[PDB]
Design a protein around this ligand. Structure first.
Ligand SMILES: NC(=O)C1=CN([C@@H]2O[C@H](COP(=O)(O)OP(=O)(O)OC[C@H]3O[C@@H](n4cnc5c(N)ncnc54)[C@H](OP(=O)(O)O)[C@@H]3O)[C@@H](O)[C@H]2O)C=CC1
Ligand code: SF4
Lengths: 114, 156, 80, 208, 292
C-alpha cells in the first residue's frame, strides 16, 4: 500500500494545515456573525468551531486529515461567500431540541431502542 | 339590525374585491411551470379572471408553487413566501409540490410543500390539466366567497 | 521603548484577558503544553491572538515554535 | 432472424478491432484491456497514471481526432480493490466513431484532473467530486454542485441509502427551516425480483 | 390506555405519543407555540376556533400528515364544547382577551368559560386538565385582570380540584405584547420591581407537566431568575433598540409587582433549564433602521 499522497508526506504538514485551518476559522467567526445577523455570541460560535475540531481526534491517516482540511477549506470558501445562508449556520448549531436521551433507563421507558 | 346589516354589506363588498383579480407570482420551478405557461394560452385565458402575471413577490396575491421543491430551494421558497401582502394564499400545483409525487423518497426533496408553507388549494396531477388549474382558481375564489371576515370582527 | 518590559507586561494583560486560562498561573518558565494542561488548539489560539493584538504576521512555523510566554516575549522583543 | 433481430455489422467491427489493437500496440505503457462488444463501440481500459497522456494522444495523432467528450463517470462498484471507474466517452468529428476510455481508481488516490486538455470536463469534474469523492489534483475549483451546501456524504454511493439522513421542515419557534433525522411516511416496500433458472447461460463465470 | 395510544419510535413526525391533546385558545401567541411544540412532539391536537381561518391555516404546517384537526365553538353553547372534549387524553385552557369587546367584558369570560369547560372535562373523565393563570392574581384591588383570574383559579379549584394550575410571570418571546408596548414609544418617571420569563422554557415546563405525573393538584410557577427593577429594564430595552385597543390596566399590571411564593415548586424542581433575557431580547428588539 505505497499510496500516492495528497498534500502532506507525514503528520507534520497535516498538523500544520489543520492548525492553519483553525486559525482561519478563528479569524472567520466575527465577520460572519456580524454580517449574517445571528442571535448567538461570538464565543459560543467559536466554541462550536473548536468542538467540531475536538470531534475528530481519532483521525490518523494523512490522506484523511488532508481531506478534512479540504472539506474545511471548501466550507470556509462557501461561508466567506454568501452562497450559504443563516439556515446553514444555524444548522451547524443544534438548538431546536431533539433532547434525545442516552441513559439506559430513559432508553428503556422511551424505548424500542438500544 | 342596521349595524350588522352594514357589516354584512361591506364584508361582501371587500370579499368580492378580493376574489376578483388574484394576480399570482410566476414562481414555476419545473414543468408545471410549462403547464402554467399553457394556462397563459389563448385557448384557456386567465386575464378573463384578472389572473395576471406579476413577477415581483411583494404585490402578488397568491403563490402558485409548481415544480419539484428541493432542500436546496426551500429556504428561497419560504423567504420569498414570508414577504408578501398580508392576505396570502398558496395554490400547490402538481404532484411534485403537493405530496412529493414521483420523487417522494430520494433525498433533497421536501415531502410535499406542506412542510414549508400553509397550503390552501391543492390541484393534483402530473401535470394538472390547464382546465383543472382554472377550476382550482375558481374554488380558491369560492374560498374567498366564504371569508365572513368583518362579520367575525364585529360579533367579536 | 519596545524592550522586554513593555512586551512582557502587555503579553501579561492579554493572557489575563484570554478566556480559558485555567488558572492564570503565568510564568516565564511556564511551558503550558506539557506543564499546564493547555492543548495545541489553545496554543495556536494564543499565538494568533498575539498576532491579532500587537504582533507581526507570525508565520506558521514560528507561530508553532513559541510554546511558552518566554519565547513570545523574546521573539516580539527580537523583531520589534 | 431476418426480421426482429438487430443485425450486426462486420467491417466496422473489424476496423474498431484493428484500431483498438493499433492503440494497444503503440501505447505499451498504459494498456490493460481493449474490447469490442456486439454493438461495435470500442472500449479501452486503463491504469490511472497516464490519463492526460492518453487523452492528449486521443485528441491528436491525426488518425484519431475524437474532439467531443462525454460523461467522465466513476461508476460505483463494490467488492473490488478499486471501486470507482472513470468512464470517458469520446466522439470524433471527422470519423463517426465512438470510444469509451475507462480508467480505474479507489476511494482516495487522486487522478490528474484532465480539465487542461478538455475544458468541458470542468463542471463534470466538480460534479463527480461532489457525488463520489474521486479527488482531482491540479484542478482550479472544487465546489459542490447538485447538492445542498450543508449536506455532505457524496450521496450516489451504495452506502448512502435512498432516503437521506437529513430532513427539512419549518418551525416558528425560531422562525426558520431546521433539519431532523428522517421520518418516512411509507415503508418503500422493496421488491424481490431475482429470478431463478439461469437467465443467461452465455455469461457463466467459473464457479468457485 | 387503548391500543395505538402507546408511544412509538423516535420522537417527532409520526411518533404517536401517549397524549391526545385538546387545546383551547391557541389562535393567539402562547397556545400557538404550545401547538408548535406538540407538533414537534407529534401528537394529535384538537383545537377549536371561532375566528377567521387564517391563523388555523397558519398553524396547519405544524403537525404531520393529517394529525391536527380544527373545529368551532363560542362563549354561548355547551354542545360544541362537549364535542371538543368527547375523546381527549389531555386538555388545556388558555383563554382571555386583554381588552373589553362590546359583548365580552373582563367579567364573565374567566367566570363563565373555565367553569363549563372544566366541568365537562371532569364529566368526560380526563386526566391532568391544565389551566393557565397570571402571577399574583389577588382579590386585592387595582387589578380587574388579576381578580378575575383569581376567581378563575377559585372555580377551577372548586370543580375538579386536582387540575394543574400554572402561573408564570410576564412572558417575553417572539411576538410579545408588553415588550412591544415597551418598544411602542413616540416623559414619565416611576419604579416597580419586575422579572419576566422566557416562552420556550415555559412551554417545556408545560409539556413536562402534561406528561410527568406527581404534578396534579398542586399548582406550579414559572419565573425567570432576573429580579431587578423596571427602570433598569427600560434602560436595557432602549439601549438594545437604540432609541433616545389599549387600556390602563396594562400600566397597572406593569406597575404592580413581581413577588415570589416559596410554597410551590418552580423551574429546577420540575427540571428544565432557565434562560435569561439577553440574546432573546436581542432577537425580539428588531425594527431599528441601520444598527445591526
Ligand atoms: N405571563 C402570563 O402568565 C400571562 C398569561 N396570559 C394568558 O396566556 C394566554 C396567552 O396570552 P396572550 O398573549 O395575552 O393572549 P392570546 O392572544 O395569545 O390568547 C388569548 C386567546 O383567547 C381567545 N379568546 C378570548 N376571548 C374569547 C372569546 N370570547 N371567545 C373565543 N375565544 C376567545 C382568543 O381567541 P381569538 O384570538 O381567536 O379571538 C385567543 O385564542 C391567555 O390565555 C392569557 O390569559 C396572558 C398574559 C400574561
Ligand atoms: S408534477 Fe409532473 S408536470 Fe408537474 S413539475 Fe412534477 S414532473 Fe413536472
Amino acid at each position: 500500500t505505497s499510496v500516492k499522497p495528497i498534500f502532506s508526506r507525514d503528520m507534520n504538514e497535516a498538523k500544520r494545515r489543520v492548525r492553519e485551518l483553525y486559525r482561519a476559522w478563528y479569524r472567520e467567526v466575527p465577520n460572519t456573525v456580524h454580517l449574517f445577523q445571528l442571535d448567538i455570541s461570538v464565543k459560543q460560535g467559536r466554541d462550536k468551531v473548536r468542538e467540531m475540531f475536538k470531534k475528530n481526534a481519532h483521525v490518523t491517516d494523512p490522506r484523511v486529515v488532508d481531506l478534512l482540511v479540504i472539506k474545511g477549506k471548501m466550507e470556509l470558501e462557501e461561508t466567506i461567500n454568501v452562497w450559504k445562508q443563516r439556515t446553514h449556520v444555524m444548522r451547524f448549531f443544534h438548538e431546536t431540541e431533539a433532547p434525545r436521551p442516552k441513559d439506559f433507563l430513559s432508553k428503556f421507558y422511551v424505548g424500542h431502542d438500544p | 339590525s342596521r349595524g350588522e346589516y352594514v357589516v354584512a354589506k361591506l364584508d361582501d363588498l371587500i370579499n368580492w374585491a378580493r376574489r376578483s383579480s388574484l394576480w399570482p407570482m410566476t414562481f414555476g420551478l419545473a414543468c408545471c411551470a410549462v403547464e402554467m405557461m399553457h394556462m397563459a394560452a389563448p385557448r384557456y385565458d386567465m386575464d378573463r379572471f384578472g389572473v395576471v402575471f406579476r413577477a415581483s413577490p411583494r404585490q402578488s396575491d397568491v403563490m402558485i408553487v409548481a415544480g419539484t421543491l428541493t432542500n436546496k430551494m426551500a429556504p428561497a421558497l419560504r423567504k420569498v413566501y414570508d414577504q408578501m401582502p398580508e392576505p396570502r394564499y398558496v395554490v400547490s400545483m402538481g404532484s411534485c409540490a403537493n405530496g412529493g409525487g414521483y420523487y417522494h423518497y430520494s433525498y433533497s426533496v421536501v415531502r410535499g410543500c406542506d412542510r414549508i408553507v400553509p397550503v390552501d388549494i391543492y390541484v393534483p396531477g402530473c401535470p394538472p390539466t390547464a382546465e383543472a388549474l382554472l377550476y382550482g382558481i375558481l374554488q380558491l375564489q369560492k374560498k374567498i366567497k366564504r371569508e365572513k371576515r368583518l362579520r367575525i370582527w364585529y360579533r367579536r | 521603548p519596545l524592550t522586554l518590559e513593555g512586551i512582557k507586561d502587555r503579553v501579561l494583560y492579554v493572557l489575563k484577558l484570554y478566556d480559558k486560562i485555567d488558572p492564570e498561573k503565568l510564568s516565564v518558565n511556564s511551558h503550558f503544553m506539557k506543564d499546564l494542561g493547555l492543548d495545541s488548539l489553545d496554543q495556536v489560539e494564543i499565538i494568533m491572538a498575539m498576532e491579532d493584538e500587537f504582533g507581526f504576521e507570525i508565520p506558521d512555523i514560528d507561530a508553532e515554535k513559541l510554546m511558552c510566554p518566554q519565547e513570545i516575549v523574546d521573539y516580539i522583543a527580537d523583531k520589534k | 432472424t431476418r426480421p426482429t433481430v438487430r443485425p450486426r455489422n462486420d467491417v466496422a467491427h473489424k476496423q474498431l478491432s484493428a484500431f483498438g489493437e493499433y492503440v494497444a500496440e503503440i501505447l505499451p505503457k498504459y494498456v490493460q484491456q481493449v474490447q469490442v462488444s456486439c454493438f461495435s463501440e470500442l472500449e479501452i481500459c486503463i491504469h490511472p497514471d497516464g490519463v492526460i497522456p492518453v487523452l492528449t494522444f486521443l485528441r491528436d495523432h491525426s488518425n484519431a481526432q475524437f474532439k467531443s467528450l462525454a460523461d467522465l463517470t466513476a461508476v460505483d462498484i463494490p467488492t473490488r480493490q478499486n471501486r470507482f471507474e472513470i468512464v470517458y466517452n469520446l466522439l470524433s468529428l471527422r470519423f463517426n466513431s465512438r470510444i469509451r476510455v475507462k480508467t480505474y481508481t479507489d476511494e482516495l488516490t487522486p487522478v490528474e484532473s484532465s480539465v487542461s486538455v478538455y475544458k468541458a470536463a470542468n463542471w463534470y469534474e466538480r460534479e463527480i467530486w461532489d457525488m463520489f469523492g474521486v479527488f482531482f489534483a491540479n484542478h482550479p475549483d472544487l465546489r459542490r454542485i447538485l447538492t445542498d451546501y450543508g449536506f455532505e456524504g457524496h450521496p450516489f454511493r451504495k452506502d448512502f441509502p435512498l432516503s437521506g439522513y437529513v430532513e427539512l421542515r419549518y418551525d416558528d419557534e425560531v422562525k426558520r427551516v431546521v433539519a431532523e433525522p428522517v421520518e418516512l411516511a411509507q415503508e418503500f416496500r422493496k421488491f424481490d425480483l431475482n429470478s431463478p433458472w439461469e437467465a443467461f447461460p452465455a455469461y457463466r463465470q467459473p464457479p468457485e | 390506555l387503548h391500543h395505538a395510544v402507546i408511544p412509538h419510535g423516535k420522537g417527532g413526525r409520526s411518533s404517536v405519543s401517549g397524549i391526545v391533546a385538546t387545546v383551547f385558545g391557541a389562535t393567539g401567541f402562547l397556545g400557538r407555540y404550545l401547538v408548535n411544540h406538540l407538533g414537534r412532539m407529534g401528537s394529535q391536537v384538537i383545537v377549536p376556533y371561532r375566528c377567521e381561518p387564517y391563523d388555523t391555516m397558519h398553524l396547519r404546517p405544524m403537525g404531520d400528515l393529517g394529525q391536527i384537526i380544527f373545529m368551532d365553538w363560542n362563549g354561548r353553547d355547551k354542545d360544541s364544547i362537549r364535542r371538543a372534549v368527547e375523546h381527549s387524553n389531555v386538555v388545556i385552557n388558555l383563554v382571555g382577551r386583554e381588552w373589553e369587546t362590546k359583548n365580552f367584558d373582563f367579567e364573565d369570560v374567566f367566570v363563565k368559560i373555565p367553569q363549563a369547560i372544566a366541568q365537562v372535562s371532569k364529566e368526560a373523565g380526563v386526566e391532568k386538565f391544565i389551566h393557565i393563570s397570571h402571577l399574583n392574581a389577588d382579590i386585592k384591588s387595582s387589578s380587574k385582570y388579576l381578580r378575575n383570574k383569581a376567581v378563575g383559579e377559585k372555580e377551577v379549584r372548586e370543580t375538579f380540584p386536582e387540575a394543574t394550575i400554572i402561573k408564570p410571570a410576564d412572558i417575553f418571546g417572539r411576538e410579545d405584547r408588553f415588550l412591544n408596548y415597551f418598544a411602542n414609544i413616540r416623559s414619565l418617571g416611576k419604579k416597580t420591581v419586575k422579572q419576566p420569563v422566557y416562552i420556550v422554557d415555559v412551554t417545556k415546563g408545560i409539556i413536562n407537566a402534561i406528561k410527568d405525573p406527581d404534578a396534579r393538584g398542586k399548582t406550579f410557577a414559572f419565573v425567570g431568575p432576573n429580579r431587578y427593577l423596571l427602570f433598569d429594564l427600560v434602560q436595557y430595552v432602549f439601549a438594545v433598540a437604540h432609541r433616545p385597543w389599549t387600556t390602563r390596566d396594562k400600566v397597572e399590571r406593569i406597575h404592580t409587582t413581581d413577588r415570589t411564593l416559596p410554597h410551590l415548586p418552580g423551574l429546577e424542581d420540575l427540571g428544565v433549564q432557565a434562560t435569561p433575557l439577553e440574546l432573546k431580547a436581542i432577537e425580539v428588539l428588531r425594527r431599528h433602521r441601520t444598527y445591526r
